[PDB]
Amino acid sequence: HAEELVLERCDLELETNGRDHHTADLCREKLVVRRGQPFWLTLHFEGRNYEASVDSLTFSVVTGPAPSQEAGTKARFPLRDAVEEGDWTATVVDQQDCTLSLQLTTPANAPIGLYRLSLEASTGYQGSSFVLGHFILLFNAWCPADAVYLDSEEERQEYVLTQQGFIYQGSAKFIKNIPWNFGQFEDGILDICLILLDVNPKFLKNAGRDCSRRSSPVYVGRVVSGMVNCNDQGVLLSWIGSVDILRRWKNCWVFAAVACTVLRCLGIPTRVVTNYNSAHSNLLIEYFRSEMIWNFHCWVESWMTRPDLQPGYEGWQALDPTPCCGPVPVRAIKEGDLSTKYDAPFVFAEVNADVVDWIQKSINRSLIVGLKISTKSVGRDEREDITHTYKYPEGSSEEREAFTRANHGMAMRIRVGQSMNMGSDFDVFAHITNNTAEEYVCRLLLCARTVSYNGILGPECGTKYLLNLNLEPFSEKSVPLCILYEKYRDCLTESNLIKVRALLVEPVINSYLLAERDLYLENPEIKIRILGEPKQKRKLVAEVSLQNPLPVALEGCTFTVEGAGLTEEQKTVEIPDPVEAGEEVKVRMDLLPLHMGLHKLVVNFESDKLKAVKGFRNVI
């Protein structure tokens, strides 16, 4: 009897769906809705209207290029009165002459994306299936069952709906606030976001599974952090917004600015954050002039539960789109629980630095990381300081025990090993001890410069850099640097002093060890031989010598001796021929022992290349 239904059209109820779903700006032409919340379609039929007693209607939805029911990317569901909460469902909520108003709901953990919605109409003995249309399904911060649920309306407004904000920069002391147009809801932007997902490496590797994994904001946040930077494929490699950048792509704060735009667009509550660092003739700074430290650094935080981790990690997750990184729970960073996925040590190193001295074991505060961590206040044009979410107050028990959890005893001093003399070559050592059970891989910078008695530094006279020095547990090393006369001879100060400095960097936790030591290059000793016998009577001969310590010969060599109680007249002696390298120059002079007790003979040796060398000898 009854003839099959003919659909005249489907009304996508854009105005009503858009407002309820907080997607109004996105629903000018196509339907955009959020998961775990009912939305509406109105069917107009040509001819007779739906009759439940006769007509059976079934819906099918698919997303992606390899949809399956088991993967959650395909569903089939009948139009009926019973509504199973948490499932794909459709039910009648209004029936007029020629119209049929439907209420559909998706699971709160449905993969996000572009769905094709089809309808199968069946009047017993016959059926006809066809395409009703499409809708995009987004994350839903308004739905208590959704992983990105945020229990505060004003926060949902700020971190999802608001299209402009501030990205903080400048410095910790002069914080500047660049205003920025995220423009997540502008024409074309949503489609661009979906494309970015569709060309990510995991899609290429397994499209069906990628599309299925888009049920998770953990997974989606992760993919986006990775996609912002052109490894290639990525987006980035002046402006005041994200929109232009994304449009051109389809055809440093900027990295975070773009991630925020994309994440807000997809429905993940997100904010840009800025960390400031500061510095205060230091090896460290010299080092920095691919893990640079900058005056500031930006990333994003996104809001979600973490069922993939142990309990207690829901909330803000750090994601770092800077040249995949995250998401890591901010609280895991503050707790030094660095085994928490994803990439915790990297985020920890952005807000921590442990700098220790051995300027002979003291704390060095010339490098300071993790200050004034900043993000825009909710619903107000001002700055919120969130330093506290990342680190405990300096000096607290909680700070220290987090330091411990993060580190699970390393030491370094400068050593020489033997006598050091002007003119000779010799090694210096960075002696490094590692009385821990851990294994470390460090950068080492070890280098020497002349230095004046006033503390001013001369030119470099030795450098050894090692990219990757390994330290085994419970072991030590003496790493040598050769100091060459040839390299220091020309650049010595008034002193015979050289400053040795070493810097050990463990870049994972972000630890820094300095050691520093001044060395004195001894002058040759003047040997004074007393020939005869100390007679309160008379007549004595003193012999003085000096072995040349240079690898080169000395010219213009002259001794000068004097000593009240021994000689009555000072005696200068010019040595005629130059003294060869290693040669021992020798002169003699006569003495007339004045009186009885002790006397001191005082000698000065002079030369063109070696000057002001002194000696003395007591007598009697």
Partner: peptide
């Protein structure tokens, strides 16, 4: 953005 400037290196320290």
């Amino acid at each position: 953005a400037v290196p320290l």
